[PDB]
Design an enzyme around this catalytic site. Sequence first.
Site, PDB file in Angstrom:
ATOM      1  N   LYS A  55     -13.060  -6.595   6.243  1.00 12.21           N
ATOM      2  CA  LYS A  55     -13.813  -5.494   5.651  1.00 12.21           C
ATOM      3  C   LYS A  55     -14.724  -5.934   4.523  1.00 12.21           C
ATOM      4  O   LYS A  55     -15.535  -5.140   4.056  1.00 12.21           O
ATOM      5  CB  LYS A  55     -12.884  -4.359   5.180  1.00 12.21           C
ATOM      6  CG  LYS A  55     -12.080  -4.657   3.916  1.00 12.21           C
ATOM      7  CD  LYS A  55     -10.981  -3.628   3.665  1.00 12.21           C
ATOM      8  CE  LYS A  55     -10.184  -4.017   2.395  1.00 12.21           C
ATOM      9  NZ  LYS A  55      -9.102  -3.040   2.040  1.00 12.21           N
ATOM     10  N   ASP A  61      -0.795  -5.197  -5.447  1.00  6.49           N
ATOM     11  CA  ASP A  61      -2.236  -4.982  -5.357  1.00  6.49           C
ATOM     12  C   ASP A  61      -2.854  -5.465  -6.683  1.00  6.49           C
ATOM     13  O   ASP A  61      -2.191  -5.454  -7.713  1.00  6.49           O
ATOM     14  CB  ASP A  61      -2.565  -3.512  -5.038  1.00  6.49           C
ATOM     15  CG  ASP A  61      -3.707  -3.359  -4.029  1.00  6.49           C
ATOM     16  OD1 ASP A  61      -4.621  -4.214  -3.987  1.00  6.49           O
ATOM     17  OD2 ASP A  61      -3.675  -2.410  -3.224  1.00  6.49           O
ATOM     18  N   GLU A  62      -4.116  -5.896  -6.669  1.00 10.54           N
ATOM     19  CA  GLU A  62      -4.775  -6.376  -7.901  1.00 10.54           C
ATOM     20  C   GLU A  62      -4.710  -5.386  -9.088  1.00 10.54           C
ATOM     21  O   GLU A  62      -4.628  -5.803 -10.257  1.00 10.54           O
ATOM     22  CB  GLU A  62      -6.231  -6.803  -7.645  1.00 10.54           C
ATOM     23  CG  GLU A  62      -7.278  -5.700  -7.359  1.00 10.54           C
ATOM     24  CD  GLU A  62      -7.099  -5.018  -6.027  1.00 10.54           C
ATOM     25  OE1 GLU A  62      -7.180  -3.746  -5.992  1.00 10.54           O
ATOM     26  OE2 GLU A  62      -6.849  -5.726  -5.009  1.00 10.54           O
ATOM     27  N   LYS A  75       0.843  -1.185   0.000  1.00  9.71           N
ATOM     28  CA  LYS A  75       0.000   0.000   0.000  1.00  9.71           C
ATOM     29  C   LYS A  75       0.887   1.247   0.000  1.00  9.71           C
ATOM     30  O   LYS A  75       1.993   1.182   0.524  1.00  9.71           O
ATOM     31  CB  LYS A  75      -0.938   0.035   1.242  1.00  9.71           C
ATOM     32  CG  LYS A  75      -1.843  -1.171   1.385  1.00  9.71           C
ATOM     33  CD  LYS A  75      -2.894  -1.251   0.292  1.00  9.71           C
ATOM     34  CE  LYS A  75      -3.718  -2.504   0.479  1.00  9.71           C
ATOM     35  NZ  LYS A  75      -4.597  -2.881  -0.661  1.00  9.71           N
ATOM     36  N   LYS A 104      -2.411   1.554  -2.770  1.00  4.79           N
ATOM     37  CA  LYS A 104      -2.723   0.595  -3.835  1.00  4.79           C
ATOM     38  C   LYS A 104      -1.985   0.944  -5.112  1.00  4.79           C
ATOM     39  O   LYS A 104      -1.372   0.079  -5.739  1.00  4.79           O
ATOM     40  CB  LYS A 104      -4.212   0.542  -4.171  1.00  4.79           C
ATOM     41  CG  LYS A 104      -5.176   0.344  -3.000  1.00  4.79           C
ATOM     42  CD  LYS A 104      -6.617   0.384  -3.475  1.00  4.79           C
ATOM     43  CE  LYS A 104      -6.962  -0.730  -4.463  1.00  4.79           C
ATOM     44  NZ  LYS A 104      -6.941  -2.091  -3.867  1.00  4.79           N
ATOM     45  N   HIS A 110      -6.232 -13.563  -7.425  1.00  6.55           N
ATOM     46  CA  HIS A 110      -7.070 -12.534  -6.841  1.00  6.55           C
ATOM     47  C   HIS A 110      -8.427 -12.605  -7.589  1.00  6.55           C
ATOM     48  O   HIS A 110      -8.453 -12.712  -8.829  1.00  6.55           O
ATOM     49  CB  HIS A 110      -6.392 -11.179  -7.028  1.00  6.55           C
ATOM     50  CG  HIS A 110      -7.128 -10.051  -6.376  1.00  6.55           C
ATOM     51  ND1 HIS A 110      -8.257  -9.490  -6.921  1.00  6.55           N
ATOM     52  CD2 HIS A 110      -6.912  -9.406  -5.205  1.00  6.55           C
ATOM     53  CE1 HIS A 110      -8.725  -8.565  -6.105  1.00  6.55           C
ATOM     54  NE2 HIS A 110      -7.929  -8.493  -5.052  1.00  6.55           N
ATOM     55  N   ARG A 111      -9.535 -12.533  -6.850  1.00  3.82           N
ATOM     56  CA  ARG A 111     -10.874 -12.739  -7.417  1.00  3.82           C
ATOM     57  C   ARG A 111     -11.555 -11.451  -7.912  1.00  3.82           C
ATOM     58  O   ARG A 111     -12.768 -11.313  -7.826  1.00  3.82           O
ATOM     59  CB  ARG A 111     -11.791 -13.474  -6.427  1.00  3.82           C
ATOM     60  CG  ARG A 111     -12.046 -12.786  -5.080  1.00  3.82           C
ATOM     61  CD  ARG A 111     -12.941 -13.625  -4.213  1.00  3.82           C
ATOM     62  NE  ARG A 111     -12.920 -13.116  -2.833  1.00  3.82           N
ATOM     63  CZ  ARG A 111     -13.649 -13.613  -1.850  1.00  3.82           C
ATOM     64  NH1 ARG A 111     -14.477 -14.625  -2.086  1.00  3.82           N
ATOM     65  NH2 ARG A 111     -13.517 -13.100  -0.621  1.00  3.82           N
ATOM     66  N   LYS A 152       2.473  -9.011  -1.805  1.00  2.74           N
ATOM     67  CA  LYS A 152       1.884  -9.098  -3.126  1.00  2.74           C
ATOM     68  C   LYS A 152       1.689  -7.725  -3.673  1.00  2.74           C
ATOM     69  O   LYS A 152       1.432  -6.762  -2.924  1.00  2.74           O
ATOM     70  CB  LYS A 152       0.532  -9.871  -3.059  1.00  2.74           C
ATOM     71  CG  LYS A 152      -0.591  -9.179  -2.249  1.00  2.74           C
ATOM     72  CD  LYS A 152      -1.880 -10.027  -2.133  1.00  2.74           C
ATOM     73  CE  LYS A 152      -2.694 -10.088  -3.425  1.00  2.74           C
ATOM     74  NZ  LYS A 152      -3.052  -8.768  -3.862  1.00  2.74           N
TER      75      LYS A 152
HETATM   76  O1  LIG Z   1      -7.214  -4.338  -2.135  1.00  5.68           O
HETATM   77  C1  LIG Z   1      -7.433  -4.780  -0.977  1.00  5.68           C
HETATM   78  O2  LIG Z   1      -8.324  -4.316  -0.198  1.00  5.68           O
HETATM   79  C2  LIG Z   1      -6.591  -5.941  -0.518  1.00  5.68           C
HETATM   80  O3  LIG Z   1      -5.259  -5.749  -1.058  1.00  5.68           O
HETATM   81  C3  LIG Z   1      -6.485  -5.967   1.003  1.00  5.68           C
HETATM   82  O4  LIG Z   1      -5.852  -4.792   1.516  1.00  5.68           O
HETATM   83  P1  LIG Z   1      -5.666  -4.716   3.138  1.00  5.68           P
HETATM   84  O5  LIG Z   1      -4.996  -5.972   3.613  1.00  5.68           O
HETATM   85  O6  LIG Z   1      -4.856  -3.478   3.366  1.00  5.68           O
HETATM   86  O7  LIG Z   1      -7.102  -4.669   3.631  1.00  5.68           O
HETATM   87  C4  LIG Z   1      -7.163  -7.258  -1.061  1.00  5.68           C
HETATM   88  O8  LIG Z   1      -7.080  -7.220  -2.505  1.00  5.68           O
HETATM   89  C5  LIG Z   1      -8.604  -7.583  -0.603  1.00  5.68           C
HETATM   90  O9  LIG Z   1      -8.519  -8.281   0.629  1.00  5.68           O
HETATM   91  C6  LIG Z   1      -9.371  -8.427  -1.611  1.00  5.68           C
HETATM   92  O10 LIG Z   1     -10.610  -8.876  -1.061  1.00  5.68           O
HETATM   93  P2  LIG Z   1     -10.998 -10.431  -1.029  1.00  5.68           P
HETATM   94  O11 LIG Z   1      -9.855 -11.102  -0.302  1.00  5.68           O
HETATM   95  O12 LIG Z   1     -12.336 -10.492  -0.286  1.00  5.68           O
HETATM   96  O13 LIG Z   1     -11.197 -10.787  -2.477  1.00  5.68           O
HETATM   97 MG   LIG Z   2      -5.848  -5.606  -3.312  1.00  3.67          MG
END
Ligand SMILES: O=C(O)[C@@](O)(COP(=O)(O)O)[C@H](O)[C@H](O)COP(=O)(O)O
Ligand SMILES: [Mg+2]
Lengths: 139, 139, 139, 469, 468, 468
Positions: D323, D193-194, D165, D167, D283-284, D191
């Site tokens: 969250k 970020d998506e 972070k 992102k 990642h979904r 990782k």
């Molecule tokens: O972009 C985000 O929010 C995260 O990098 C988490 O950040 P934090 O760890 O800082 O919250 C993940 O991609 C989500 O957890 C995806 O959700 P899920 O796992 O439900 O698909």
């Molecule tokens: Mg993410």
Amino acid sequence: MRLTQGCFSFLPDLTDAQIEKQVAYAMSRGWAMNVEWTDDPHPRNNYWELWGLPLFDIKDPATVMFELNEARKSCAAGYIRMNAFDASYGTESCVMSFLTNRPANEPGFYLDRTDGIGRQIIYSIKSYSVQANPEGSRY
Amino acid sequence: MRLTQGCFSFLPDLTDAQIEKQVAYAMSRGWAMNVEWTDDPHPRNNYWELWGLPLFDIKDPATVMFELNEARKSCAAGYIRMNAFDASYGTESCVMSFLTNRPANEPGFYLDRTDGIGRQIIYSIKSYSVQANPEGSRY
Amino acid sequence: MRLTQGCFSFLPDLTDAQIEKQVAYAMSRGWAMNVEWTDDPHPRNNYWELWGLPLFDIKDPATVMFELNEARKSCAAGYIRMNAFDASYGTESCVMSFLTNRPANEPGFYLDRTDGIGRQIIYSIKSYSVQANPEGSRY
Amino acid sequence: RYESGVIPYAKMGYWDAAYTVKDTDVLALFRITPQPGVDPVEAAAAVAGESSTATWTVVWTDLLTACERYRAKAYRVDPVPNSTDVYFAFIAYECDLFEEASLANLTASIIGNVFGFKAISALRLEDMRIPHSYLXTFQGPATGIIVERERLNKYGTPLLGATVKPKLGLSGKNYGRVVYEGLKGGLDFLKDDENINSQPFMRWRERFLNCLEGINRASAATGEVKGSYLNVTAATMEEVYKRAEYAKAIGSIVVMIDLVMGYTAIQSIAYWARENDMLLHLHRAGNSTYARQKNHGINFRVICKWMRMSGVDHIHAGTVVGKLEGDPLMIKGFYDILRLTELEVNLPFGIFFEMDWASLRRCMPVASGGIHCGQMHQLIHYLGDDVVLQFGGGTIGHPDGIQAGATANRVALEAMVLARNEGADYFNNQVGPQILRDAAKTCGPLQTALDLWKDISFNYTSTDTADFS
Amino acid sequence: YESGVIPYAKMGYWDAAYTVKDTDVLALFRITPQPGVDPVEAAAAVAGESSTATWTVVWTDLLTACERYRAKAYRVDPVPNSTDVYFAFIAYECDLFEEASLANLTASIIGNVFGFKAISALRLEDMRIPHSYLXTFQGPATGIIVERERLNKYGTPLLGATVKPKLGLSGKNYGRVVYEGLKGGLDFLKDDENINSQPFMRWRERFLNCLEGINRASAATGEVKGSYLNVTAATMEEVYKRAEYAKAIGSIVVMIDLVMGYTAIQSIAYWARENDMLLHLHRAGNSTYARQKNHGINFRVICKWMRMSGVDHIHAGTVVGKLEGDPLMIKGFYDILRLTELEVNLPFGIFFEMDWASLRRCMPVASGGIHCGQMHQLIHYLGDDVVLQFGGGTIGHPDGIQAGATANRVALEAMVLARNEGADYFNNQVGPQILRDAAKTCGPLQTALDLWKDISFNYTSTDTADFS
Amino acid sequence: YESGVIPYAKMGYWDAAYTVKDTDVLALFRITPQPGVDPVEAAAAVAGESSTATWTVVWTDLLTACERYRAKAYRVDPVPNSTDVYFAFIAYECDLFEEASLANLTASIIGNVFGFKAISALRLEDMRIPHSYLXTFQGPATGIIVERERLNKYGTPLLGATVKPKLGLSGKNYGRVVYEGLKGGLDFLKDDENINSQPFMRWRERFLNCLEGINRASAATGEVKGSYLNVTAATMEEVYKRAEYAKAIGSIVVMIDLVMGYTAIQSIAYWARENDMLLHLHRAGNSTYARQKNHGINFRVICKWMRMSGVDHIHAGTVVGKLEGDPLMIKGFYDILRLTELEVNLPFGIFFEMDWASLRRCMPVASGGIHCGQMHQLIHYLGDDVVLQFGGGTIGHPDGIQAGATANRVALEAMVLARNEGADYFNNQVGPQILRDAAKTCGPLQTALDLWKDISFNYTSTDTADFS
Ligand SMILES: O=C(O)[C@@](O)(COP(=O)(O)O)[C@H](O)[C@H](O)COP(=O)(O)O
Ligand SMILES: [Mg+2]
Ligand SMILES: O=C(O)[C@@](O)(COP(=O)(O)O)[C@H](O)[C@H](O)COP(=O)(O)O
Ligand SMILES: O=C(O)[C@@](O)(COP(=O)(O)O)[C@H](O)[C@H](O)COP(=O)(O)O
Ligand SMILES: [Mg+2]
Ligand SMILES: [Mg+2]
């Protein structure tokens, strides 16, 4: 550790009498003998140092033992091996190799690992004796 | 530095009473325990030395603790790990591994860098203990 | 020449009585019949023109003969074939096809040769009837 | 039946209450909400027809085929408990309808058109029974949980991770810094970020080289195998392969892909990962556009099945307490679907079909998003051992730096599992939080994290909920 | 698990109460124990040494789900009328086998067990290949149905002929013979199994001259025609090269020989599907292990393996020709190759019920020492979906190759026409009279019937049934 | 040449006065005629149907140098003590055979003749492969001499062991077992023939963990080490992929299974030479046709074919182990694999004099149900240039894998040392005492000798000599 190159290295170190019977066997087959020295124990150290020429149809196994004992007196601490060579068609190669001398203490090796592509490892076997000191001063 | 292989290496060194409790948890799952030793701390040293066979028949945790204390008396200074094996279909693998012993001083590693193509670096992790001395004399 | 597509074209042209026994055999197997027409005799002319729909479990072989004779009255000079289709799992295909009508005179084909690479020839089979006149005017 | 015109789908062979299910059939469970005045059985026959062989009017061309073999059959229609005029419909499909090894083909039939059908106001695919004989045509996980842990030399405890972070916006150099710090302080992985692919603020090669320096640095500082999920998601298959190949060429243990890439590219990369000795994290991204609401879409449990078939090594699967949406019973069902060798009917978990996994490897669930170390007892309770717990904000947001954040998470983890293994009633609110406080007395990073975040929660009404208790 | 030797039947390889699963691979072995060897111990030894066992106990079993992976002998029956010989049924877990790999299946099932001293003779008689394993295999590249669609030929056996002499012809002459046979009425000809590339004829000359002959015959008749161009070669690289050449010039078909072996065969079977080519399998070498009842591999098993691998044709016997073929055994082979599923049928040697999992149908080929005078017998024993091949029976005709071809085809059409009309054609009166009636208006057939009427091959069979 | 059927012996396929040429391929068949079939006609039929003949006369012979291409049965002898069975010698012109093609040679020699109704049983016993055909083949990729040079191991058999259990182990555990066996003293281990790639272990995991174990064992001992990584796969493409992977990671060796078949085997044998790889051949399936004396292919012929194709090792028998192996037959196989030329030696089944044309020597492998207590017998029957493989004999040791390995190696070195000193080691006193003397100073050997001393496999042989 015990360097287990050679064909009798899981038996105790051979006496002179035992070596002589091996020499006699090889010479009775008509094979040529030679003596070689090294202080690089690496498994891929193909060419140990020649002690003179191979002893081509020398007939008395005592003459082979004399040369082995001359090599023992002259060469630095390390390894000596005894080889027999068969020059016959179909072979034209070594047909016997065993250690006649080894160091009192061989530290052996470690495995050096380099990260290659993906999960592959690029390996190098390193000798403790060789990395520390030059040829003639390793043991 | 502290070697943080194993699943409890961010906690203090485990006492014997704590180790027995982990052993007991594993054995009530029907898992098999074994004990392994190394003095090569490299992260890719997959195969630590076996202390006898894994204890598949064994049912009392003190038996496992006995073998662990036998390994500790016999092996050179270095690392010991305790493993649990689950042979059941779907797993057929290790399901627990933690360090029971570590050296009083681990110098750890350096990162050796070779210039590859372009900006790529070819990396090798080297142990201070392993490069200096052979197996059995490293700590 | 005699066009020898179909399964009985090395026998004489079938009479109506012979065709009817073939129809009866196919219908007794539970197969569906249809009638098709063309004046392109090319071996690769997969899709001859449909005469109505296939006659799915029509039970009386006389009804199949009526439709064949209607097709003979309506279609231009050329070929008519009679097919049986088996929609069963494992087949789902034609299982019988024979000619019920052919022209009085079929000139047949020639082999057109184009020089390809090296010694290879690129072949096209050409119909004399098709190259001269449009569909409905070839015989 | 074969005279021209429109007849009901239930009279065309798509309804059969006496149908005997075969072990080679693909089965689907749909939650169907008929429009007012539409017969519930006819609606189910319509879904069966239009996802198999039917159209809206009779066609004689049926008779050129083994038409009875290929028609799918709706065979059971139950009212949904406490949900007036909604029904569960079970439909059986012949094995031979589906192209071998093809998720695209399976989905073309099962979800292609039937969700847009006017006569049903809402449709949701809730579960499927993928038969043993179809499953053997698929690879399954490129690596799978067991080999993954062998590659990492890590057993007996959840794995740890963290999304970098902010992102978007970091340089490649700064990315590698975060990764270095996170890994050295104790994380198994970080990782991308998506949405981190390649952008004006950071082109992907810079990220990949700098991260490899960070990773190898952390490995040399700790004696552990380390990695970070390098995101190879890209516009085209060509560019995605280029990124994957580059990660392999420089020795990364792992890459990630986003679900928005889509099924065909995912299958391609899952085969690639097996062939190239690479861990493949999914990642979904986008999943919740169709998986969130109870009345309509695709339940995430079906996506779990499709992605384990396709052969990703990790898939995000929920946290319960973080969250993002995640009812505990639904989540436990997802995790079972990903990890078990076979499934038994378990209606409270949303498992409607008994199903053998045909020895396809196990897919590693990933628990991520708005979680923190004060929740460790809950995360261990709900989720078990074979999971990656990812703390993005929960690592990098630590007031004393990234290393301290990482260390807090790992000490919490190990202390919780040690105590569990000792027999502690750790999920009990009297026990878990105290385990964490006890470890924290000798670990300043953990004390600080607990002080900062211990009271943070995300408690809201779930949308994706069970129908049985 | 203490160190040492214990009987295979005590190691988990015999279970009389085993419940066979639909995913199991099943094998039926005809076992002849050495004197003094218990029949059940022998079966357990075959089960163990084809799954997970060796000769002495190993602790390393305990690192695995050992119970799942052990194969189980589950039934041992005496063979009828065969003193001290047994039928042994063995079940193997699905997960033992590499997906889509005949090489792996055979490594286990035939790898070592036939050499065990403790068994004086061993024969693999049948196997149940489960649906879930079959879906990992291609099956036929083309299959009977698409093949007939490509040919535009339905409701009558196809016809063929091996070019003769076996060896010695030039490429030009090969093309001549193929032109003549096809123009006279044959659907196909073929290279002999041993025609590959040799000093008297290098393969490219054969391929190009054959395409001229084929295309000439097609333009002369208005039919699709072809000849099986043999791509069998020393290496995969050379085999591919010959197959690619055949495709590049428009051949409908190629052939391969079984001596190429399973790995090359699977490669070419995938290639044939990918390249729109019919793939004919000659079973060269099959009788080295398939002839004798006491030992080896029954050809019915080979049928299953090659249908899985995905050849389009396989030679499967004639009954009345120059090669071995008990009619009950042959009927069994033909059913294995052609049906969508098999029911237990002990007189045909069908020991297991088995679904073919919608793998395509493989075309049986009836070849070797047959002639048109036997047409009623061939139609009776072998049915519609078969290629009837007459090498000497075409080329041996005194009035030339076109005459030989024409005789076979008239005989075939006359016979099928009569059958469809309801004639009791297999009857010894009616069959040969149908042929004589056709021959009254066809000189070539009259001559062929006169030349070969006394020719039969009646000898005692080796590969015979155990049930009636 | 008038149309019709005439006996094969009247068609030019029998010639008692034929002068064999040095360029001819010769075959010796054991022929069992059906009752009433003349022995000479049967031999002529095998000659004809494996060269140029079919069942009826064909004018197309006249387009060829027919006399040159016809094979000739030239001698038919009764088999000693075997009523109505004959040894038939047949000569084949060099030009019949495609250069460098085992597939083509076998298409002719074994293709169809074993299925002929007129012969109730047929066995190919030996062949004379002429010098001029042998120079078209590679021979061994590496051969015994270069192999030992790559290993730096001379004057003593090499040692190996198959990993057990056969199936079920993970890649990681596979690497563990290989590490332990190599570190304990074995030169090699190997994948089991049926270990390819499967749900319990995909092949890349095995290959990479094995390289770690191999390299660890080499660094622990200062010796070259390896394990035969099995590249056997369904397709040539997948086999190449596995072989390429093994090369890319530094493996000294790979293995293949005979069930891959001849075309794939020749491809990999060329590949092994091109890629500096040792190529081990497991003979999976060989006993399906090689076990029985009446019918099939004698394994000695297979030896010739695989030495020609160019594998570096082939499994060739133990005499005293769990698989079939008459000592006279085994000695014959070993001579075929290892010598520069063969002289007629009827008790060893060497029927033809044959020069090997300086094709390299193939390493025989002795494997299956053997243990260190038999070391004197193994040295006596099999000689110096052999790999002695102890799977259960290593992994079955109660004190662990390193102990099993160490026992075998001490036994081997002790035995060779004594032999070279002139000990009458094969004698039942001296052999087991050499082992006991060594065991007095080696706990592992003491334990191994105690555990397995009662173990033998004595049964009646099927594959036996006809001369003494
Ligand atoms: O972009 C985000 O929010 C995260 O990098 C988490 O950040 P934090 O760890 O800082 O919250 C993940 O991609 C989500 O957890 C995806 O959700 P899920 O796992 O439900 O698909
Ligand atoms: Mg993410
Ligand atoms: O070489 C031959 O003998 C043939 O060409 C037949 O020639 P004819 O038609 O002239 O006899 C065939 O290869 C055999 O039929 C093979 O036997 P099978 O079909 O039993 O495998
Ligand atoms: O599968 C087996 O049985 C072996 O691994 C031996 O295991 P053990 O060493 O544990 O017996 C070998 O493949 C056989 O020796 C093959 O027989 P051959 O060498 O006769 O072809
Ligand atoms: Mg032939
Ligand atoms: Mg084996």
